[PDB]
Design a protein around this nucleic acid. Structure first.
Ligand SMILES: [K+]
Ligand SMILES: [K+]
Ligand SMILES: [K+]
Ligand SMILES: [Mg+2]
Ligand SMILES: [Mg+2]
Ligand SMILES: [Mg+2]
Ligand SMILES: [Mg+2]
Ligand SMILES: [Mg+2]
Ligand SMILES: [Mg+2]
Ligand SMILES: [Mg+2]
Ligand SMILES: [Mg+2]
Ligand SMILES: [Mg+2]
Ligand SMILES: [Mg+2]
Ligand SMILES: [Mg+2]
Ligand SMILES: [Mg+2]
Ligand SMILES: [Mg+2]
Ligand SMILES: [Mg+2]
Ligand SMILES: [Mg+2]
Ligand SMILES: [Mg+2]
Ligand SMILES: [Mg+2]
Ligand SMILES: [Mg+2]
Ligand SMILES: [Mg+2]
Ligand SMILES: [Mg+2]
Ligand SMILES: [Mg+2]
Ligand SMILES: [Mg+2]
Ligand SMILES: [Mg+2]
Ligand SMILES: [Mg+2]
Ligand SMILES: [Mg+2]
Ligand SMILES: [Mg+2]
Ligand SMILES: [Mg+2]
Ligand SMILES: [Mg+2]
Ligand SMILES: [Mg+2]
Ligand SMILES: [Mg+2]
Ligand SMILES: [Mg+2]
Ligand SMILES: [Mg+2]
Ligand SMILES: [Mg+2]
Ligand SMILES: [Mg+2]
Ligand SMILES: [Mg+2]
Ligand SMILES: [Mg+2]
Ligand SMILES: [Mg+2]
Ligand SMILES: [Mg+2]
Ligand SMILES: [Mg+2]
Ligand code: NA
Ligand code: NA
Ligand code: NA
Ligand code: NA
Ligand code: NA
Ligand code: NA
Ligand code: NA
Ligand code: NA
Ligand code: NA
Ligand code: NA
Ligand code: NA
Ligand code: NA
Ligand code: NA
Ligand code: NA
Ligand code: NA
Lengths: 144, 169
RNA sequence: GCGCGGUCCGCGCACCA
RNA sequence: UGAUGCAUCCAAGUGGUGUAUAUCGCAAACUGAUUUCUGCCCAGUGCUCUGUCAACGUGACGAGAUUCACCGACGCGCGGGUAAACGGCGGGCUCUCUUAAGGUAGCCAAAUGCCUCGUCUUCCAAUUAGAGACGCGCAUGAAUGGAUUAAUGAGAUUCCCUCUGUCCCGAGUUACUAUCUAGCGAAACGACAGUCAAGGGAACGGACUUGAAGGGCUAAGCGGGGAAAGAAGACCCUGUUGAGUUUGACUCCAGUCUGGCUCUGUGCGG
RNA sequence: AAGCGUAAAAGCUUGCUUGAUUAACGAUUUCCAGUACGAAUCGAGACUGCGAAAGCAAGGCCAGCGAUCCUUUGCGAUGAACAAAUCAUACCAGAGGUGUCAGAAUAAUUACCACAGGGAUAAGGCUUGAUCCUUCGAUGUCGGCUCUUCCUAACCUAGCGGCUAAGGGUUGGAUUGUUCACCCACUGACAGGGAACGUGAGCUGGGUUUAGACCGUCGUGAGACAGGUUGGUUUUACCCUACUUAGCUGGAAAUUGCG
RNA sequence: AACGUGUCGCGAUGGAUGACUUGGCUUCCUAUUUCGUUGAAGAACGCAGUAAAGUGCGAUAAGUGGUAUCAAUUGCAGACAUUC
RNA sequence: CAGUGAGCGGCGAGCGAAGAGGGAACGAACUCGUUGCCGAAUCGGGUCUUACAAGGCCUUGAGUUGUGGCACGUGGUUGGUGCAGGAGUGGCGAAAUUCAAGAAAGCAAACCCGUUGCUGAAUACAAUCAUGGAGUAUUGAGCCAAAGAAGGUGUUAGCCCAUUGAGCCAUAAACCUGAGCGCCUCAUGAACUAAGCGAGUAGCACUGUUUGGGAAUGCAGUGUCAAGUUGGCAGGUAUUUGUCUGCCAAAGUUAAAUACAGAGUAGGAAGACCGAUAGCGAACAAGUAGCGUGAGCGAAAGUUUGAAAAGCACUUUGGAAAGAGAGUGAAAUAGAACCUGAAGUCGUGACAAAGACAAUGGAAGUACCUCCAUUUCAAC
RNA sequence: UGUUGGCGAUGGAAAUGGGGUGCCCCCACCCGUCUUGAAACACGGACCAAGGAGUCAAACAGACGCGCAAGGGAGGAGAUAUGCCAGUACUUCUCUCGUACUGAAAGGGAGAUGCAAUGCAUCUGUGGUGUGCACACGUCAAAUCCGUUUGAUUUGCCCAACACC
RNA sequence: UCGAACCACCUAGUAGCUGGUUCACAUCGAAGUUUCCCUCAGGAUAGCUGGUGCUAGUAGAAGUAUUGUGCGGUAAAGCACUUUAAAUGUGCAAACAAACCGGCCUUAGCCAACUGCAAGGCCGGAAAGAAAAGAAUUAGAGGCACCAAGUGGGCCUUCUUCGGUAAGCGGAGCAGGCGAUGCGGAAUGAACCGC
RNA sequence: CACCGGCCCCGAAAAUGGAUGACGCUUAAGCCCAAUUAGUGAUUGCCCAUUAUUCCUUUGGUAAGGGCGAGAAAGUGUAGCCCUUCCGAUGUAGAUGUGGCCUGGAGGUUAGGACGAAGCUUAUGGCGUGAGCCUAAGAUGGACCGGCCUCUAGUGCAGAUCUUGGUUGGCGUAGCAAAGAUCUAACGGAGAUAUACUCAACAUGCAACGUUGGAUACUGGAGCGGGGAAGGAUUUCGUGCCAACGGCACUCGUA
């Protein structure tokens, strides 16, 4: 809305908040990111360390679909089980089955304490996750 | 006095804006509801004209290609000649009785071929000739942990299989 | 930096920190 | 420069100009009638004649991409010529060295001499002027032409005779204006205004401080002030602003020359 | 270079040596934004040197040096359908350099000249040439002619015994654009100064200062010369005030009160 | 005195404001939708009882024919309705 | 996907895509050359069938230096004759007050009482005398609505007019009626009758350009110039050597979904837009009048009097323009470009003073005026 | 907080405030600008009307308002109310930002306690210490209408947050 | 119209330079300085200022004294630069996350050893909570963040001064002013006197 | 006798007439000290600030208390819910706040108008610190429009050598001066011989125009003569007319 802007508060004041000594002029420092090495060096070096240079190897035709690999944690595993099966679950008997690749995940990581034993089907798994789930009472089955 | 802002990359340094000297390069969407209405009206008219034939022809079911979409299914372009032969149909006759045909597809495994043959047979059963969704595999039911599953870990198997290819040759 | 001649001196040639 | 030419236009072609020509011709430069002369220098830079390297080609290493070596034209380098080519003509009897040579015949305080109103003679009562002589000439000089010259010049300078209101030193007259009337009728300019002395002040006030004048309204003049009008100072400086021109500035492009391949065939020899 | 420091030494001689090495991204000082670079201080680990030993030493105390990208050397993953050998690339540590040294790859001339600005800056006041306060959307520049006024530190004239006195005077000619200077002649005498270095809508235009052209010296050149020479548009008052003359008419509570 | 100054009532010169709007600008949609040697687009000259411009038309020239409609057109003139 | 943990870039300023996924569209697919088998069965021209037939008859004209064909009961798309419907287009086609009152104005405190009560009889007015538009308004009753929709009409209209529903009439050819329906002619679908796949091409070298394309993404010029299914091309880092995967260049046609960034024809619908110095340059005889040798440049300007011309007959002064009367009209203070009619400037009448301190300005009083407001009047 | 006079008897009145013009005493440099400094001999400045200058889009951030929350939200498109209606009502799938980072890369990938030294066992739970709202338990002052307040402090747990591990 | 004609267009070319920039009250209120820049008529950066807050309101306070304890080589003094050495200055401390006095636990940290020293904790005690000797005072709430403007030409005076003959001249140190500000006085004056 | 201080004089010379601020002052109205009504006896001679003290009013707080015959709302901000109390108040560049003011349009709500809307005028007052709002009168106008809550934007002018249109002083002014020059009578024409009267007439209708006759001059054969090209395109001719144009005038005209 134009009625809330600062220019409506400034009608009658000649300079509009820019001063009589240093006026409001077109481009007093250059256009764009000009001068990042000469006269804007302090700004660049103190707020954006690492802007200039090269690092690492190249990869000419990157495709992200072969690189798809999302992750989920043991203490988060309960989002993928329905409430009734979670209540019915108990170590030593019949456990719920979780399909990570159908739920949208690829790798199982092992942070935290597992809140319910279950059988997990995953493409990948880590050492700690495998060990912890085996101790809890569930199991992990590799899929493709 | 530029403080702590991002470094901008707004990319607007060609003559896209129409002014007294420039024609511009812009595209607005102010005809969106009108065009949507027109499309719907055309579809209703076409269905009325081609009645009693269905408006959209029969299509197969295929798997999505990459490793990110491996687990999903959608509609394909047309049925392959192997599937048509296994259903006992001529391609040129199927094209007239309302089935889409695609002679480029390959049929590299038996499961997809079975699914499409079943689709064709259902359609042929339900079709009447005047004289002149996709299916996902079923979820697994709850079970119990076995002795081997309790005893051994799968991480070592995964890692050894990865190392075989990584350091093979 | 390079070919020559008699460490140097003469030629004729090359130049993205 | 003898036409297969020299100079040269055009994006191009069986294209164009000097050339409807043909060395008593055509093209490109310099000096500037006649008369008299035109001195010395080829070191520099030009212009001209007589080892090094590009493409290509050949051989060797290698599985191969490669790599190495040899060959390879002008040009450059070396050596001659050339000053009516650009230009130069000093320094310490000599001798030298600079870098090649050291200002010849002439001319001059000149439209070229700083010092300088040079020194001498002449011209006037008196001449920083003029003329004639003299030359250690800041810094004259030979087709970057030197010296001289009758006739000619809306060229630049000095003197003499004649003549005169240029002057001593101004006076009188005429026509048209200005001046007044009838008719007709603008512009420029325009913060507001408009009497002085001293003081202080962005250091030269109409307006402020303290004094001193000043009744209002008018006609013809005048050029002291209004730091009067005219035009975003053309001098000087600034800007990471221009343009014209030059070159032995950086980076390039036509034009000219040179080599290879291609156009490209047939026989006899070495 | 200079300062500080040092006597069985930090100086001199001498014997053995290479702590001038490596040092897990340890912390800190100086500059400072509490950023880097250069330099320096306190340390931990390895392998060592000298010494009987405690100890001392990771150069010569304190000035002597350098980013990204690129090239190159040493050390120890990739080339995406798969495999081998070359080749290229990557992570880490150095070297090749930016002296305008927190780091573009850079010659002149314009008098034929241009634009945006600047009294932030050159060509009346202060000090005594200096300075840079006003003026760059402009305050017309030397000399002469013409005309008025003022000063005194008195040239003549006038009084005194060197003093008083600014009242009235202070000339015309040759050469030169001159101011100044010099010379001839008259005179009682041929004094010195201020007024925006008085005075250009008062004049003149000889000088200086544009474009044309010649010379000397300078430059390879285009061109330059507080060197010489010749030729080169001088605009407007009819407004207000000042001044000079020329007319009409109110007014003493200086227009009113009868004050 | 006159000229000048100031305030109020009335009047001139001038053409703002408000109200109005057969115009512009912008956005959408539909289709038996795309000129010319069978002479186009453009350009010129003419045509009415009265007719300069504009509009329409072309020596059949402010229009001829056919359909539909139904009594005008109008500045002034002039002259089949069961539709001439 | 993606302003991208791709990539290009004095690796600076900056630039910059593709595969996959959800969708729109979709009856979407076909034709030559080559190989094999036929070999004029083909084309043009005359002529006859209603016929410049995809038909018959005839023709050396073209063509064997190869036109054409074939393969791994139905036809309205052969032609000639007839006659139907639908859509589209154009005409026709609907209700209800010119109702009553000439103060034609009010009050009775959410609703009801109220279909009822009570409020003046007016003449005011105008710096003695005369003078002073049109009812879509007000108030009360009453109707129509499958129509309240916006325009016209002398002021604000559902009822005064127009418009709109159902529903009728007419309609060369084209479009739809799976094939619209017949007849003649002609075609034709179902039952009997061995090798092969596009040469100055792809590639390679040099040079130039273009790309995000990086030991080279696409293209162009010259030099050079292949292979044969065993083969060739592509798999985003160059070379040589083995595998694997996808596809078969160097010939052709093809609807829909998409653009219309200063087009056009016929026909429509709109807007939190502008409101005559705005919006197109142009609301008007506007690309006009005018300017320039020319290429070109290019305005100003609402006729907005009034409801209706009723647009001032007649008297009279003047050469006339005009003035003074009279008249039309609700208004002439609406008199011809004539609605309203501002500021600035000027004339005139009355008044106030005083211009020897430029004016303007501030603070505080007073003299005179005041078409202004408020208060009081016999109790404060 | 009363008392005594004047004017005012319904007018062309009286009074009190506004407004207008003149006069007297006092005060008072011309506006806008740039500048250390303007009344300036520093620039712009005859009068009036109408017009006339921080806006639209796109990327990011901080503060404030609103919805949902380990999840939030599309977009494009479709379906039928729907055939006035460019609006409103409804929607599968997907996509995107986030819940996990790190390495040049091949790649790897985060709980506590006890006992031991890809180990074993339990799982109602802040990894520890210092400084730390409110609440709970005690104690002491001041004031008090005696009912309680206003303060201080001790101990327990300490929420948010900061410092050291 | 010529040291590169005219017409239309790219083009509203770019400008660190000049000019302009439209209503009122209220609460607050500057800087001409630092570092880097082909930087010097301009930027970025810190300081000065505004807005928004967070947190356990007197807390980890101070442009000022007192007491205790350190640093210094200027004025003056002296001499054939230097011992001697001020006045004005400047660092630290002055009882509640501190420190004190005796258990215990842990560590190799040091030492020939430890119950010695070092370091981190637990437990218990004392406490004019800081007396008396001139023996502080406060218009005395401590700490922590986020977002952003203008400014980056200064000038005058008191004392101290370097250059310059001097100067209404150039360059610095400390503080106060003007700029940004009137009012009352010095007859008048940016800066003097009072406020 | 020498020196050594207080006041005064000499040393001490400029350009428009002039400056203790001016007049003036000398038993000071000058200079250096010292008093406050004078040896009489307690305490302050008097004049002038935007300062100090105190009183009234406004406005804002890092605000502090109380309440919930006309009156009271559990409350940031108003015509403030009501009452009491204390402290501050200037400011360029700059920041922020405001139940702060104003303009064109949209969604709602409440209203006005032919018994007179918008617009316009003002010695029309009232209210507000202010931006502004409201009433009155029109001897103005003739058809539309106000308040409140939200939404929206081409939203506020004194100056830019600002843009377009109108006006204005200068001002009845500067000027309308080359090319020699006209006079007279009679006709024509509204262009006159134009009077309140007295009055013979002048002193009270001026100035200027066309045609014809006469007079006087000029051009002077390289002519203000008679024909043509380029350029122009009806300016040619007759009859009328005289608004505008022919920079004065017209009865006349290339109008
Ligand atoms: K030579
Ligand atoms: K002078
Ligand atoms: K030379
Ligand atoms: Mg690299
Ligand atoms: Mg900054
Ligand atoms: Mg800053
Ligand atoms: Mg244009
Ligand atoms: Mg002479
Ligand atoms: Mg010679
Ligand atoms: Mg001659
Ligand atoms: Mg200038
Ligand atoms: Mg020793
Ligand atoms: Mg060193
Ligand atoms: Mg050293
Ligand atoms: Mg000087
Ligand atoms: Mg001269
Ligand atoms: Mg040179
Ligand atoms: Mg009198
Ligand atoms: Mg009088
Ligand atoms: Mg064939
Ligand atoms: Mg080829
Ligand atoms: Mg490119
Ligand atoms: Mg092929
Ligand atoms: Mg217009
Ligand atoms: Mg009118
Ligand atoms: Mg994260
Ligand atoms: Mg010319
Ligand atoms: Mg303040
Ligand atoms: Mg001393
Ligand atoms: Mg300033
Ligand atoms: Mg204030
Ligand atoms: Mg301000
Ligand atoms: Mg608008
Ligand atoms: Mg008035
Ligand atoms: Mg605007
Ligand atoms: Mg005159
Ligand atoms: Mg005259
Ligand atoms: Mg004249
Ligand atoms: Mg004659
Ligand atoms: Mg003659
Ligand atoms: Mg005339
Ligand atoms: Mg005639
Ligand atoms: Na600035
Ligand atoms: Na001589
Ligand atoms: Na005069
Ligand atoms: Na470190
Ligand atoms: Na200056
Ligand atoms: Na590009
Ligand atoms: Na009736
Ligand atoms: Na300005
Ligand atoms: Na000023
Ligand atoms: Na400036
Ligand atoms: Na600044
Ligand atoms: Na500045
Ligand atoms: Na005095
Ligand atoms: Na205006
Ligand atoms: Na004459």
């Amino acid at each position: 809305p134009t009625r809330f802007k600062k220019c409506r508060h400034q009608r009658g004041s000649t300079f509009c908040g820019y001063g009589r000594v240093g006026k409001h002029r077109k481009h007093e420092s250059g256009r764009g990111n000009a001068g990042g090495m000469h006269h804007h060096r302090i700004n660049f070096d103190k707020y954006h360390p690492g802007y200039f240079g090269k690092l690492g190897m190249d990869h000419y035709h990157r495709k992200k679909n072969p690189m798809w690999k999302p992750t989920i944690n043991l203490n988060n595993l309960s989002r993928l089980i329905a409430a009734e099966e979670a209540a019915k679950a108990a170590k030593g008997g019949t456990l719920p089955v979780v399909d990570l690749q159908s739920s949208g995940y690829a790798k199982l990581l092992g942070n935290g304490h597992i809140q319910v034993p279950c059988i997990v089907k995953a493409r990948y798994v880590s050492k700690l996750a495998d060990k912890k789930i085996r101790k809890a009472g569930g199991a992990v089955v590799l899929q493709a | 006095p530029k403080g702590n802002n991002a470094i901008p990359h707004v990319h607007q340094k060609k003559h896209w804006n129409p002014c007294s000297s420039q024609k511009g390069n812009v595209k607005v969407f102010l005809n969106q509801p009108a065009q949507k209405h027109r499309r719907r009206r055309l579809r209703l008219l076409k269905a009325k004209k081609v009645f009693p034939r269905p408006l959209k022809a029969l299509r197969p079911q295929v798997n999505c290609p990459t490793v990110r979409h491996n687990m999903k299914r959608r509609l394909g372009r047309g049925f392959s000649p192997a599937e048509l032969k296994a259903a006992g149909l001529n391609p040129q006759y199927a094209a007239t009785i309302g089935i889409r045909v695609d002679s480029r597809r390959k049929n590299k495994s038996e499961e997809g071929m079975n699914v499409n043959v079943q689709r064709l047979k259902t359609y042929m059963s339900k079709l009447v000739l005047f004289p002149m969704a996709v299916v996902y595999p079923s979820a697994e039911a709850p079970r119990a942990v076995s002795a081997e599953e309790k005893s051994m870990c799968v991480y070592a198997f995964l890692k050894k299989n990865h190392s075989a290819v990584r350091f093979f040759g």
